[PDB]
């Protein structure tokens, strides 16, 4: 029940927090499952980045102190990760799997690209200038990763 | 999925189903929006979505080995259902419009990713006309996302 812009921001930020926490487990499996070590290396590097982004949200919460992470499961992200795992189970460890796994991971990143774009806007509107900057850092990383995924997808 | 063509046809059927579901969802969301600008944005994008359905249909009529498998895109169904849940969790004001724009951007970015993959793959399989039509859709989805960011920023006019 969202009655303020602040309610919306905190709900979305908790949504994304859960998405990040889930991704820490999911990306490890996907790196394992990939045929190319290039794709496995990208999945691992982004696992380290995802831990960094979780820490950024923790920094936002610690600084604002009127903000409290709501414990909720991000259902969308859970679906997207599970769709990646279904790719791994429906394919041999060949170039076909790598194509479909890149595709699933880009769906993951673009979920995040949308989410962090909204979070930046809302934090700017509510006056959380520092939080907006941290969220913008995370946004840019997500966009960078999708771009690298698109490259591995063509290369 | 044993070949790249199979991945292509599976994703194309997924996107087709997604576009079909968006035809219903975008109209309901236009109904629910508080701002007349947001409702007009949703309706115009409904018209564009119908065009994108037509593009995939033309690709299908043109390739003739390609066959849409009747399936449900569960991801898109979840994203639509979350936009509808915003409507039921809010009054008809700028709070609803902020959260509804957010949900619509999540839908759009599912599609941006999907169509980016479909373009990449169609270029590999030799469906040049199809790759060009899919790239037209990709650019539309991207533009819709930018228009939503503008409306998100214009949603609040305090300072
Ligand atoms: Zn992330
Ligand atoms: Zn990410
Ligand atoms: Zn569309
Ligand atoms: Zn669209």
Residue B126 Rama label (left phi>0; alpha psi -120 to 50; beta): left
Sign of the dihedral through C-alpha B4, B124, B56, B150 = positive
Cα–Cα nearest to B130, from B50, B52, B18, B17: B52
Contacts 24+ apart (CB under 8 A), B47-51: B48/B140, B48/B144, B49/B19, B49/B22, B49/B23, B50/B23, B51/B140
Q: How far apart are CA A75 and CA A15, in angstroms?
A: 9
Please name which of B71, B7, B66, B123 lies closest in space to residue A91, comparing C-alpha atoms: B7
The alpha-carbon radius of gyration of chain A (Å, integer) is: 16
In this structure, what DSSP letter does residue B157 have? -
Angstrom CA distances, B150 to A11, A22, B38, B47, stand at 21, 30, 10, 20
Among B91, B116, B158, whose Cβ lies nearest the Cβ of A106? B116
Q: Name chain A contacts of B82, Cβ cutoff 8 Å.
A: 75-76
What is the stated resolution of the deposited model, in angstroms?
2.3
Q: Out of A83, A100, A114, whose CB is closest to B75?
A: A83
* Cβ-contact A119, B102 below 8 angstroms: no
Identify from A114, A145, A151 which residue to disrupt to test chain B contact, counting B C-beta atoms within 10 A and taking the largest count: A114
Write the CA distances from B64 to B3, B59, B68, integer angstroms.
18, 9, 10
Q: Say if CB B7 and CB A104 are below 8 A apart.
A: no
Let me know how many helices (H) and strands (E) chain B has, helices first.
5, 0
Task: Identify the experimental approach.
Answer: X-ray
């Amino acid at each position: 029940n969202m009655k303020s812009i602040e309610d919306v921001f905190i709900h979305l930020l908790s949504d994304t927090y859960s998405a990040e926490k889930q991704l820490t487990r999911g990306l490890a499996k996907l790196a394992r499952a990939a045929s190319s070590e290039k794709l496995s290396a990208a999945f691992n590097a982004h696992l380290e980045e995802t831990q960094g982004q979780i820490e950024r949200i923790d920094q936002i919460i610690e600084q604002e102190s009127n903000l409290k992470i709501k414990r909720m499961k991000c259902v969308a992200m859970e679906g997207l990760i599970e769709e990646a795992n279904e790719v791994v189970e429906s394919t041999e460890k060949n170039e076909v799997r790598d194509a479909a796994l890149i595709a699933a991971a880009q769906k993951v990143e673009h979920y995040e690209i949308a989410s962090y774009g909204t979070l930046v806007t809302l934090a700017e509107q509510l006056g959380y200038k520092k939080a907006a900057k941290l969220l913008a850092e995370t946004l840019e990383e997500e966009k960078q990763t999708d771009v690298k995924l698109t490259d591995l997808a063509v290369g």
